[PDB]
Amino acid sequence: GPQPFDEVYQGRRIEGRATGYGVFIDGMELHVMQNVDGSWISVVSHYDPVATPRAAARAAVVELQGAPLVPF
Amino acid sequence: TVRKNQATLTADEKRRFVDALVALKRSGRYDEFVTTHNAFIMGDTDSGERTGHRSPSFLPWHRRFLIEFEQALQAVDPSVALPYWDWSTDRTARASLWAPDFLGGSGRSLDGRVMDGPFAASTGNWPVNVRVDSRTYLRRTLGGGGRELPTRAEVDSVLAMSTYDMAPWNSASDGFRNHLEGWRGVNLHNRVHVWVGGQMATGVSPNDPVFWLHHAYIDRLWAQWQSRHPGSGYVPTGGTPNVVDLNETMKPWNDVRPADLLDHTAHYTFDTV
Numbered sequence: 639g640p641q642p643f644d645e646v647y648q649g650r651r652i653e654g655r656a657t658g659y660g661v662f663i664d665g666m667e668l669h670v671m672q673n674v675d676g677s678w679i680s681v682v683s684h685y686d687p688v689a690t691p692r693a694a695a696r697a698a699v700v701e702l703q704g705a706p707l708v709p710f
Numbered sequence: 711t712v713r714k715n716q717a718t719l720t721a722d723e724k725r726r727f728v729d730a731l732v733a734l735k736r737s738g739r740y741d742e743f744v745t746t747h748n749a750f751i752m753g754d755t756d757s758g759e760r761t762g763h764r765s766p767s768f769l770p771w772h773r774r775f776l777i778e779f780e781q782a783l784q785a786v787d788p789s790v791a792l793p794y795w796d797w798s799t800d801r802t803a804r805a806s807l808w809a810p811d812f813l814g815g816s817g818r819s820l821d822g823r824v825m826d827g828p829f830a831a832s833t834g835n836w837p838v839n840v841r842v843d844s845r846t847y848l849r850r851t852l853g854g855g856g857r858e859l860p861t862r863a864e865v866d867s868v869l870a871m872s873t874y875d876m877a878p879w880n881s882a883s884d885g886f887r888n889h890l891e892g893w894r895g896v897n898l899h900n901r902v903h904v905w906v907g908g909q910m911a912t913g914v915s916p917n918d919p920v921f922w923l924h925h926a927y928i929d930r931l932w933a934q935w936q937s938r939h940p941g942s943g944y945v946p947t948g949g950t951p952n953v954v955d956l957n958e959t960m961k962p963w964n965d966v967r968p969a970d971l972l973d974h975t976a977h978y979t980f981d982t983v
């Protein structure tokens with residue numbers, strides 16, 4: 639379903655790992671969720687849906703401005 | 711309890727309101743609300759149990775949450791009432807809401823850090839404890855990159871929608887609730903969270919005191935919708951799985967139903983509706 643990815647975006651490693659699918663930023667999990675229209679949000683950008691988990695990870699990197707995620 | 715438009719508050723009312731917020735923060739009670747809200751943000755899904763968001767109970771849930779919050783503020787200072795932010799009118803970063811004697815302004819460019827007002831991290835009075843990342847300081851990007859708040863005509867287009875909510879009772883619904891919440895259509899409530907930026911745009915959005923004023927205005931818009939459509943009831947009205955029907959109790963309180971919350975006037979009135 640959601641496509642795996644693993645790349646550096648603005649100095650952060652962003653991953654979509656298939657087992658169960660999880661998004662990670664510098665090895666910490668980004669809580670994400672899919673809306674029924676197929677769009678994605680995250681706990682870092684909750685109110686602004688984007689098209690894919692990669693797009694959600696990139697939006698989170700912009701928002702974080704270098705900051706690490708903490709556990710949820 | 712009379713909830714006033716924030717734009718009409720006096721210097722004295724602002725001082726008491728922000729002093730009450732700072733005391734509620736110090737007591738730990740403030741962060742309990744952030745924790746509870748984050749729990750429903752993470753928990754509520756389109757396909758599963760949904761109570762606080764993306765569901766018909768978005769409106770009564772937030773009404774009850776705000777009543778709880780305002781009663782906690784009143785235990786600090788019984789003169790205080792939650793004000794509302796009409797973002798259709800007070801629609802720029804230059805609004806009096808964002809002055810240093812009220813909520814303070816936007817975040818600086820480097821790190822989004824709020825640098826003025828009572829909630830600026832440098833005060834030591836607003837540590838961000840309930841967090842999704844390492845940053846312990848309030849951040850905002852008010853209108854960042856040219857984002858626009860909803861207009862009065864866009865609000866009126868949603869107030870005109872006579873149906874409260876529709877199956878499938880989630881982010882895909884047509885009707886008033888989902889268009890007010892903003893997962894479909896012109897987008898009122900969600901877009902305002904995004905416009906403030908910083909923590910307000912995240913899953914720990916009640917870290918920004920503006921959360922309460924935005925939700926007090928969304929709550930007022932529900933009252934205005936009821937006045938426009940007095941015969942439009944809350945739906946659904948029974949037997950809907952994973953959804954709070956009219957006469958079911960809501961978590962976390964488990965002792966109040968949407969039916970008990972449709973009339974706000976048992977709890978507060980508005981300066982004007």
Ligand SMILES: [Zn+2]
Pocket residue numbers: 747762763772
């Ligand atoms: Zn909420």
Ligand SMILES: [Zn+2]
Pocket residue numbers: 899903925
């Ligand atoms: Zn909200």
